[PDB]
Amino acid sequence: PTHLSVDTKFKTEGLCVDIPGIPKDMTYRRLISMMGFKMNYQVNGYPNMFITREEAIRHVRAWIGFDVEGCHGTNLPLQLGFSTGVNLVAVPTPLMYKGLPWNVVRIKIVQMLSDTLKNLSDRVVFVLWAHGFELTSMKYFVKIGPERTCCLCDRRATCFSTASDTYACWHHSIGFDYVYNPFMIDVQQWGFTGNLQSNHDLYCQVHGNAHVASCDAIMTRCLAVHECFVKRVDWTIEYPIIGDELKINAACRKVQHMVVKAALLADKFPVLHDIGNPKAIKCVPQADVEWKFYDAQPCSDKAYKIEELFYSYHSDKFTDGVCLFWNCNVDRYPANSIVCRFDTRVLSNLNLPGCDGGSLYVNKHAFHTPAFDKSAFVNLKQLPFFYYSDSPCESHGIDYVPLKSATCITRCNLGGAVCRHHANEYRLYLDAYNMMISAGFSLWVYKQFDTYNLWNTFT
Ligand SMILES: Cc1n/c(=N/[C@@H]2CCC[C@H]2CO)s[nH]1
Ligand SMILES: [Zn+2]
Ligand SMILES: [Zn+2]
Ligand SMILES: [Zn+2]
Residue 150, annotated as binding a ligand: yes
Nearest ligand (C-alpha, residue 225): 3
Q: Are residues 146 and 267 in the same domain?
A: no
CA–CA separation, 100 and 90 (whole Å): 5
Verify whether ligand 1 is closer than 6 Å to residue 112 (CB atom): no
CA–CA separation, 113 and 55 (whole Å): 20
The number of CA neighbours under 13 Å toward the Cβ of 42 is: 17
Verify whether ligand 1 is closer than 6 Å to residue 85 (CB atom): yes
CA–CA separation, 69 and 331 (whole Å): 40
Bridge-based pairing state of the strands 166-168 and 159-161: antiparallel
Q: Are residues 45 and 173 in the same domain?
A: yes
Nearest ligand (C-alpha, residue 411): 4
Residue type, 143: K
Q: Are residues 141 and 221 in the same domain?
A: yes
Dihedral sign from CA coordinates of 137, 143, 145, 150: negative
Question: Would you state the torsion angle of the CA atoms of residues 422, 423, 427, 432, taken in this order, to the nearest 10 degrees?
Answer: 0
**How many structural domains is the chain composed of?**
2
Verify whether ligand 1 is closer than 6 Å to residue 224 (CB atom): no
Identify how the structure was determined: X-ray
Q: Is residue 184 part of a domain?
A: yes
Number of the ligand 1 atom closest to the C-alpha atom of 120? 8
Backbone φ, ψ for residue 311 (5° rounding): -105, -175
Q: Which residue out of 83, 113, 127, 220 has the highest number of ligand 1 atoms within 8 Å of its CB and is therefore the one to mutate?
A: 83
- In contact, 239 and 287? CB cutoff 8 Å: no
Number of the ligand 1 atom closest to the C-alpha atom of 85? 1
Nearest ligand (C-alpha, residue 219): 3
Q: Are residues 303 and 398 in the same domain?
A: yes
| Strands (DSSP E) found in 102-248 | 125-128, 142-143, 159-161, 166-168, 178-180, 183-186
Q: Is residue 100 part of a domain?
A: yes
Closest CA to 309 of 332, 335, 290, 326: 332
Q: Are residues 257 and 192 in the same domain?
A: no
CA–CA separation, 64 and 148 (whole Å): 22
Q: What are 65's strand-pairing partners?
A: 127
Burial readout 382-405 (b: 16 or more C-beta within 10 A, e: otherwise): ebeebbbbeeeeeeeeeeeeebeb
Write out the catalytic residue numbers: 67, 69, 134, 211, 216
Backbone φ, ψ for residue 255 (5° rounding): -65, -40
Q: Which helix (H) or strand (E) element contains residue 223?
A: helix 213-229
- In contact, 141 and 106? CB cutoff 8 Å: yes
Q: Is 262 helix (H, G, I), strand (E, B) or coil?
A: helix
Domain boundary among 188, 205, 229: 229
Question: Would you state the torsion angle of the CA atoms of residues 373, 374, 377, 383, taken in this order, to the nearest 10 degrees?
Answer: 120
Closest CA to 268 of 315, 320, 321: 321
Residue 216, annotated as binding a ligand: yes
CA–CA separation, 100 and 85 (whole Å): 18
Q: Are residues 225 and 251 in the same domain?
A: no
191: exposed, middle or buried (Cβ count in 10 Å: 0-12, 13-18, 19+): exposed
Q: Is residue 409 part of a domain?
A: yes
Residue 360 to residues 86, 119, 229, 333, 380: CA-CA distances in angstroms?
A: 21, 16, 8, 23, 26
Q: Are residues 151 and 294 in the same domain?
A: no
The domain in which residue 403 lies consists of 245-458
Q: Is 178 helix (H, G, I), strand (E, B) or coil?
A: strand
Q: Which residues contact 283 (CB under 8 A, 6 or more apart)?
A: 253, 256, 257, 260, 261, 326
- In contact, 375 and 333? CB cutoff 8 Å: no
Number of the ligand 1 atom closest to the C-alpha atom of 63? 11
Domain boundary among 167, 197, 229: 229
Verify whether ligand 1 is closer than 6 Å to residue 78 (CB atom): no
Nearest ligand (C-alpha, residue 424): 4
Q: Is residue 8 part of a domain?
A: no
Dihedral sign from CA coordinates of 5, 7, 12, 16: positive
Number of the ligand 1 atom closest to the C-alpha atom of 117? 9
CA–CA separation, 414 and 156 (whole Å): 57
Q: Are residues 210 and 297 in the same domain?
A: no
How close is the Cα of 385 to the center of ligand 4, in Å? 18
Verify whether ligand 1 is closer than 6 Å to residue 349 (CB atom): no
Domain boundary among 174, 200, 229: 229
CA–CA separation, 409 and 405 (whole Å): 9
Verify whether ligand 1 is closer than 6 Å to residue 353 (CB atom): yes
Residue 408, annotated as binding a ligand: no
Q: Which residue out of 207, 352, 355, 361 has the highest number of ligand 1 atoms within 8 Å of its CB and is therefore the one to mutate?
A: 352
Contacts of the segment 307-314: beta carbons below 8 A, 24+ positions apart? 309/275
Q: Which helix (H) or strand (E) element contains residue 339?
A: strand 337-342
CA–CA separation, 316 and 100 (whole Å): 66
Bridge-based pairing state of the strands 441-446 and 95-96: unpaired
Q: Are residues 221 and 125 in the same domain?
A: yes
- Helix/strand/coil (H/E/C) assignment for every residue in 93-125: CCEECCCEEHHHHHHHHHHHHHHHHCCCCCCCE
CA–CA separation, 418 and 393 (whole Å): 9
Residue 320, annotated as binding a ligand: no
| Strands (DSSP E) found in 25-77 | 63-69
Residue 340, annotated as binding a ligand: no
CA–CA separation, 73 and 249 (whole Å): 51
Bridge-based pairing state of the strands 271-276 and 290-295: parallel
Residue type, 209: N
Residue type, 46: Y
Q: What are 79's strand-pairing partners?
A: 69, 89
CA–CA separation, 428 and 407 (whole Å): 14
Bridge-based pairing state of the strands 125-128 and 142-143: unpaired
- In contact, 187 and 134? CB cutoff 8 Å: no
CA–CA separation, 420 and 400 (whole Å): 8
CA–CA separation, 52 and 69 (whole Å): 25
Q: ∠ CA 386-390-393 to the nearest 5 degrees?
A: 105
Q: Is residue 234 part of a domain?
A: no
Q: Is residue 413 part of a domain?
A: yes
Q: Which residues contact 58 (CB under 8 A, 6 or more apart)?
A: 237, 239
Residue 169, annotated as binding a ligand: yes
Residue 423 to residues 254, 386, 393, 402, 404: CA-CA distances in angstroms?
A: 16, 13, 10, 8, 9
How close is the Cα of 435 to the center of ligand 1, in Å? 23
How close is the Cα of 429 to the center of ligand 3, in Å? 38
Verify whether ligand 1 is closer than 6 Å to residue 264 (CB atom): no
Burial readout 346-379 (b: 16 or more C-beta within 10 A, e: otherwise): bebebbbbbbbbbbbbbbeebbbbbbbeeebbee
Dihedral sign from CA coordinates of 286, 290, 294, 299: negative
Q: Are residues 362 and 264 in the same domain?
A: yes
Q: Are residues 303 and 429 in the same domain?
A: yes
Q: Are residues 329 and 252 in the same domain?
A: yes
Gaps in the chain with C–N over 2.5 Å, residue before each: 72, 93, 313, 397
- In contact, 414 and 455? CB cutoff 8 Å: yes
* Cα 144–chain centre separation: 29
Q: Is residue 2 part of a domain?
A: no
| Nearest alpha carbon, ligand 1 atom 2 | 84
CA–CA separation, 66 and 186 (whole Å): 10
